[PDB]
């Protein structure tokens, strides 16, 4: 069993720096196949993928928000910290942290492909207002 | 540009925990409880190197060596006592009475007890008599029984084995080392700037005592006081003396050792009779060597407790195991009334010239014999000490003191063996096991060549 | 290549007496110097070790120091039992030897 | 002062000296490595303990290519993040104990790099010998 | 599909893959090798068993000259009787488990040849250095 | 008389033959090295004993630079005091057992020299690689 | 504790060979820091150093008496043997064998310096007469 | 009365176990060997010129 719990302030002012932390348990982030994603969904519309971090210490971000995103992991505290800067009024959305399950196969070098994101979080709401 | 290189065999060590094994010189069928014949011979002259430009921290209160060898001793005692007679059949009614013989007046310490003892054949029983001390028998609603009959099966020591304190060396395996400090004014905890590496320790004599450390090593420079928290009154205090005081203890009496059969293949030895007068055991301590010794330690305690009157008083009371000074002498367990020793106080201001006290004056003590012993401060075991024919005399040197502190003005220090483990802490305070890490990585300008 | 010191440094008691033994860079400058006391008819005994330290057994009065190519042995609280022949010696490496001094006399 | 050849020094000698000076006394430490009753069990446990500790170091050395070499250079470069101090002040101003304490956090990363680098040194070498 | 460097793979990984692909994951397996009460005896029996198994492989490697080399070429030629399959179908069409099962009968003959060949490589080399 | 290849000989074979002849049978001896109840304790004590003895020889070989080499030359010269007999009479007129008996007194001195010499071979080599 | 005892004939004729042996106990001559010196003192004058031998098998003699002196050690018998030849009438003096305590430090190579000679012997008297 | 009553408690052989003299071999570990002589006229002590390992 794996549990993903996230936390962060709801009322967020623009132009400052915000921190999102997702707490995980029941598994380690250094073992094979581990990885946590970050999904966004403004109300009433489809989802959006922020970034992801694997057990290989490899960080992958969206092209449109590469400079605005930097992710990190904590082995001791057993958490993943997401930092975003220079928010906009359109940033009002629900943030999800989820765990992925994947497969490995060899084709001119070992490759890892994800079969689907299995374990999701409850979600945390962030608003841009005053 | 710089490149990485790997060094093997660098002088690097890291604190670690590991097992140890004994080592002692060859001695020579002779039987010993410590099985020193099975211990590895140590060396004529072991290798010891004094390190320089090194400071290492020490902490004897969190030393695993004391904890390790503490469990070794109890197992060693158990290993030797398994093939020895068990005194369960002796739990029989005792018809005890005053001993008659032609000080002598105070004869209420040994009683002539008679009982029916099973002979070699089970069905037949015959009457037998033996002498028992008053501390090992309790009365009933006018008969007596052994104190242990309602606690546990109570065994015996085979006389073939001797349990004298032969010094032994605890030595670690390869890849580990023991670090030894050499500062003469080193307390229990703190840095040591004259650490020396040694393969293993010196001869350590396992001695069982409550209030006084006997026939041990002495401090070099001055008196050493060690305690984890001096301000805390609930923790015992270890005192190591730089000058020793001799102690002479004896049990003057020629007591015939009588063998009594209690069953098929079972035979135990008891006290037969008294040839002469009844005389109590005693211990003699010189007046000057003790008055001076308490004088030197008194001023040492003044620094830790400034402008405070220091007084030494007898133990509170309660159980006899820790109230009295318990020790061993030829295999006889003594319990000395230590009340006159701590009958003085130190005044920080005054004159203390030793010539005032008369010389050739000794401190006689009252000591009692208890041949049924429960040990390690746990009621789960026995060792019935058998008697010895003739009179015995044991001479030793006092080495250290185990004191305890108990609102303003006078400070009261009392003797007490709160824990047994402190007996060996006074000997292993300057030792620490450590692991070696011979791997070292540093940058350099050298690059590995690749053949093309 | 031999240490030179003043022989017959006799003086009164109940005061501080200072003695010196000179050497060279090879002996005093680049090595350590130790002092010894020898009443005639028996072996000497150590007083000064490492030019500033003393073994367990020597009184608090005996003390010394090293400065450049010269050393000293400061003794205070002189008594009637503090008279003997005093020496200073040091390894030199010129002959690869522990050449000794010339010996002094301390008479009250 | 008469000179010691550094082969006569005892175990753990030169520990408080500089790293460069202590690099000349690697031999003495290597020699000391692998030097029914109650005592037999503890002694037997000690013998296995010594073998396990010695074999752990040799296993790492073999993978890194320094199977028997006491001092071996490698191809991986040093990273300034792990250590920023200059060469002059490293080999002549501190001891080995301080150096290991400083970089104890980056030990895991360096160990993996040596295995990855040396393994790469083998496959490309094999490709070269196949051209005959 | 993102790429794995093959150093992050777990123990016994790539076992079901081709022999050529599995040749790039030799490092991970080497790391795992050498990783009074009733439990103590069984645990103690386990520690000695691990040491004995690891040392057995290293003893063979030393005689063959691959004391520390993970991949080492030799001078003895391959015999068609032991295996008749081409190189292309060996490194790219089956796994290591099948290969060892196929040639398990001829392992004794190959082992002796390596000792004889390597031993011959030593005596003739010694003769060459004696000409100085 | 048919010929034996010297690989088929048994353990401790050629012990009574000349030193030169016995030098061709080093392989066979190396193979045999590392070949709850009362029996278990004695058997367990035997397994650790074999491991300890084998590792003692390998530890010395690694320091001397002959980590895996069965026959290895060195740079230290031979001293006439240790042995005065000529080469012809050593390899063709006596056995290995006699030779070890003769020089058993000087074994300690030679062992230290190899460690000192090989250690010197490492530091000077390192200095050569630093010129790039 | 270390004890040093020496022995040798008192009446020694000139031009012959004499042997001085100093026996030691409580330590070994192979361990680090071991070393024994030889000191002469003709009666009524200062001391004189003859030679010294360390645990490194290194022998150091006085320059003025290099050819006349040769020292040796015995590991089995646990003794040091001093041989002197071609004595003179001025050889009348007391022989002392003593043990040294020293220090080690590194300066362009490890060096050993003697802080002093600690343990001395009782002494043996030799006379040159007939 | 039984002879052993006044000496020591005397145990019993369990009939389940049999103590017939089964031949056994004492074998040494690796790194050690056992040398066997073959001279037919060899007494307790002396040289053996047909030793076999
Ligand atoms: C930092 O700390 C350092 C260590 O504390 C310190 O160095 C030490 O300095 C002191 C002061 O100079 C030295 O003290 C001298 O010691 C002589 C004896 O030395 C020999 O014995 C030592 C102890 O040996 C036991 O304990 C060892 C513990 O490790 C064991 O390894 C031994 O096996 C042995 O154990 C046996 O005995 C134990 C009880 O003794 C027992 O429990 C155990 O079970 C077992 O039975 C050894 O350490 C020492 O070994 C060193 O030196 C030898 C060569 O000498 C080497 O081979 C070794 O490798 C090692 O390096 C020795 O074997 C004393 O005899 C001597 O006494 C004389 O001097 C004092 C004052 O200095 C006098 O009070 C005394 O009376 C003696 O003088 C008298 O007699 C002479 C005649 O002989 C006379 O002329 C004179 O006038 C006077 O009357 C002295 O005490 C000590 O040796 C140094 N080293 C060590 C290791 O302790 C250092 O200074 C400190 N400071 C720094 C570095 O700045
Ligand atoms: C469990 O089992 C399954 C199936 O059994 C397996 O999946 C298959 O794996 C193999 C090997 O990893 C795959 O084969 C490779 O496929 C790639 C890509 O194939 C596509 O593209 C080619 C054209 O390039 C098309 O023809 C093809 O139909 C596909 O559309 C090929 O590129 C690979 O070729 C290399 O390997 C061959 C065999 O080793 C060589 O003969 C060939 O020359 C290539 O080698 C060269 O590659 C580089 C080219 O530049 C060069 O740099 C190199 O040095 C080298 O010389 C190869 O054929 C196959 O497609 C998979 N099939 C699937 C997924 O359905 C799993 O991988 C296996 N599980 C594990 C864990 O391994
Ligand atoms: C415990 O700690 C103490 C002090 O912390 C330490 O004592 C000191 O040790 C160091 C190193 O051993 C000593 O420093 C050396 O000193 C010598 C001699 O110094 C005298 O002479 C110089 C002029 O030559 C004067 O300036 C000086 O004031 C003294 O009078 C120097 O020669 C040494 O230089 C070498 O080492 C330097 C640092 O490594 C190099 O930068 C320098 O280039 C020298 O290296 C070169 O030497 C050869 C020159 O030809 C060359 O062949 C070599 O290849 C190499 O390139 C060095 O500065 C210091 O003096 C000591 N201080 C004292 C005793 O008070 C103890 O040693 C230490 N304990 C232990 C066991 O180590
Ligand atoms: C603290 O440390 C001191 C210092 O050792 C101890 O005092 C010694 O303690 C031991 C052990 O109790 C004493 O040893 C005993 O000596 C007896 C007398 O020996 C002398 O007399 C006989 C002839 O009667 C001579 O042959 C001998 O050479 C002596 O001159 C012995 O009779 C005892 O024998 C025991 O051991 C033998 C060994 O085979 C057995 O066969 C016997 O049955 C018997 O069990 C014993 O050896 C020693 O005398 C004490 N003094 C000294 C100076 O050593 C303290 O006891 C110790 N205190 C503590 C609490 O540990
Ligand atoms: C070294 O050896 C000396 C002497 O050999 C010891 O000194 C002796 O110490 C004891 C204990 O202190 C002295 O005995 C008495 O101590 C009393 C302590 O006062 C408390 O207890 C009394 C008890 O009634 C209370 O009334 C009082 O209020 C305190 O609570 C003193 O009060 C006694 O003094 C009386 O007697 C002396 C006798 O000389 C008279 O001069 C006084 O005027 C007063 O009447 C008494 O002193 C004993 O006297 C000391 N003897 C001396 C100094 O020669 C050292 O203790 C010992 N060293 C160590 C470390 O113990
Ligand atoms: C202890 O009591 C026993 C009796 O239970 C005494 O034994 C008797 O002693 C008297 C006088 O010595 C003899 O006349 C009897 O023959 C003894 N009978 C037996 C059965 O022993 C014994 O003497 C008493 N011992 C002491 C020291 O009081
Ligand atoms: C501590 O002990 C000293 C003596 O050892 C005490 O000194 C005496 O104190 C009383 C008052 O309590 C005075 O009458 C005496 O004159 C003092 N003695 C001398 C010689 O002057 C002291 O009082 C005790 N208490 C404290 C706190 O020091
Ligand atoms: C001399 O005696 C005096 C007693 O007055 C000691 O010092 C005093 O101790 C009391 C303890 O209650 C303090 O209240 C005083 O403040 C102390 N006096 C001073 C001036 O501080 C003093 O320690 C004794 N002398 C020695 C050497 O111990
Ligand atoms: C120092 O010691 C001397 C040794 O006796 C003490 O002097 C004695 O003092 C008592 C009591 O005053 C007299 O009865 C003796 O006659 C004295 N004897 C001698 C030889 O003088 C002296 O009291 C001590 N000093 C103190 C206690 O301060
Ligand atoms: C300690 O007290 C005793 C008391 O008996 C002193 O013994 C006296 O000693 C002298 C000299 O030996 C004799 O002349 C006396 O006759 C002894 N007194 C007697 C027998 O009552 C002893 O001297 C005292 N201690 C000192 C050091 O004097
Ligand atoms: C116990 O001893 C007393 C001693 O007077 C004796 O009178 C009494 O008879 C004894 N008990 C028995 C049961 O004989
Ligand atoms: C040991 O340390 C103490 C202080 O902790 C110091 O006073 C003493 O001089 C040291 N011992 C030496 C330098 O021998
Ligand atoms: C022991 O000594 C150290 C240093 O000298 C000191 O800091 C400490 O307070 C002392 N006492 C204890 C209980 O550690
Ligand atoms: C023991 O230490 C005390 C501390 O005051 C000192 O007075 C005494 O002289 C010392 N004795 C010895 C023999 O070191
Ligand atoms: C000792 O215990 C007391 C109890 O309150 C505490 O205040 C003090 O800090 C302790 N000191 C130590 C552990 O050194
Ligand atoms: C004690 O009695 C025995 C036996 O009668 C005797 O040999 C011994 O001398 C007596 N004890 C004394 C001190 O006389
Ligand atoms: C010790 O003896 C004293 C008197 O000498 C006495 O008051 C005390 O009660 C005794 N304590 C014990 C435990 O025997
Ligand atoms: C310590 O005890 C031993 C033996 O009991 C004895 O020889 C020695 O003299 C005692 N020490 C002192 C200082 O009396
Ligand atoms: C064994 O030795 C004896 C003499 O010890 C000899 O007579 C006999 O022939 C030898 N056995 C052989 C050569 O088979």
mmCIF file of C-alpha atoms in Angstrom, chain A residues 32 54-58 60 103-106 109-113, chain E residues 1-6 8-10 13-14 17-18 21 24-25:
data_model
loop_
_atom_site.group_PDB
_atom_site.id
_atom_site.type_symbol
_atom_site.label_atom_id
_atom_site.label_comp_id
_atom_site.label_asym_id
_atom_site.label_seq_id
_atom_site.Cartn_x
_atom_site.Cartn_y
_atom_site.Cartn_z
ATOM 1 C CA UNK A 32 14.004 0.552 -9.201
ATOM 2 C CA UNK A 54 12.608 9.311 -11.132
ATOM 3 C CA UNK A 55 14.721 7.166 -8.820
ATOM 4 C CA UNK A 56 17.700 7.801 -11.137
ATOM 5 C CA UNK A 57 17.833 11.459 -9.990
ATOM 6 C CA UNK A 58 16.651 12.474 -13.479
ATOM 7 C CA UNK A 60 11.952 16.078 -16.564
ATOM 8 C CA UNK A 103 8.260 -1.371 -17.572
ATOM 9 C CA UNK A 104 11.834 -1.846 -18.777
ATOM 10 C CA UNK A 105 13.088 -3.313 -22.050
ATOM 11 C CA UNK A 106 16.230 -3.265 -24.188
ATOM 12 C CA UNK A 109 20.196 0.369 -24.758
ATOM 13 C CA UNK A 110 17.931 -0.233 -21.777
ATOM 14 C CA UNK A 111 14.776 1.895 -21.848
ATOM 15 C CA UNK A 112 12.073 2.688 -19.291
ATOM 16 C CA UNK A 113 8.501 3.326 -20.449
ATOM 17 C CA UNK E 1 10.902 5.710 -23.744
ATOM 18 C CA UNK E 2 13.508 7.245 -21.448
ATOM 19 C CA UNK E 3 16.848 5.461 -21.230
ATOM 20 C CA UNK E 4 18.336 3.524 -18.319
ATOM 21 C CA UNK E 5 22.118 3.588 -18.045
ATOM 22 C CA UNK E 6 22.211 -0.111 -16.971
ATOM 23 C CA UNK E 8 20.619 1.526 -12.059
ATOM 24 C CA UNK E 9 19.286 -1.970 -12.805
ATOM 25 C CA UNK E 10 18.706 -4.383 -9.946
ATOM 26 C CA UNK E 13 18.443 -7.969 -14.155
ATOM 27 C CA UNK E 14 18.657 -8.498 -17.909
ATOM 28 C CA UNK E 17 17.647 -10.554 -22.518
ATOM 29 C CA UNK E 18 20.251 -11.345 -25.170
ATOM 30 C CA UNK E 21 22.827 -6.854 -24.083
ATOM 31 C CA UNK E 24 26.777 -4.437 -20.331
ATOM 32 C CA UNK E 25 25.362 -5.215 -16.849
#
